[PDB]
Design a protein around this ligand. Structure first.
Ligand SMILES: CC[C@H](NC)C(=O)N[C@H](C(=O)N1C[C@@H]2Cc3ccccc3N2C[C@H]1C(=O)N[C@@H]1CCOc2ccccc21)C1CCCCC1
Ligand SMILES: [Zn+2]
Length: 90
């Protein structure tokens, strides 16, 4: 995942992303995720968190904060406040 530290490199992994998945590469790459080349499995370049089974309306940033709240990339991009709220702390 060192190769995956840039937005451009992440975007390139979605070459063979299945077109039927209802979440788009741009939103995934922007939230830190790259395609691992099987089904709809993606991983974060920073925290190595894996996500799959994307559904219509899923928001990669929200899912990042839901499952991997301590990710430093996530915190730097969205802030600890956003992460806390996703985690149900106000
Ligand atoms: C990504 C949005 C999606 N919306 C439905 C979603 O919530 N996906 C979950 C998801 O992607 N998860 C959830 C699991 C549960 C969990 C508990 C504690 C810490 C992390 C956790 N999750 C991570 C993630 C997941 O299953 N990742 C898998 C397992 C680890 O290995 C890989 C590697 C690549 C891609 C995915 C995963 C999903 C997994 C299977 C179907 C049910 C929910
Ligand atoms: Zn992460």
């Amino acid at each position: 995942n060192l190769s995956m530290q840039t937005h451009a490199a992440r975007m390139r992994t979605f070459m063979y992303w299945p077109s039927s998945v209802p979440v788009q590469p741009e939103q995934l790459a922007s939230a830190g995720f790259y395609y691992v080349g099987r089904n709809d499995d993606v991983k974060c370049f920073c925290c190595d968190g894996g996500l799959r089974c994307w559904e219509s309306g899923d928001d990669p940033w929200v899912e990042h904060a839901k499952w991997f709240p301590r990710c430093e990339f996530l915190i730097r991009m969205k802030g600890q406040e956003f992460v806390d709220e996703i985690q149900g702390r106000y």
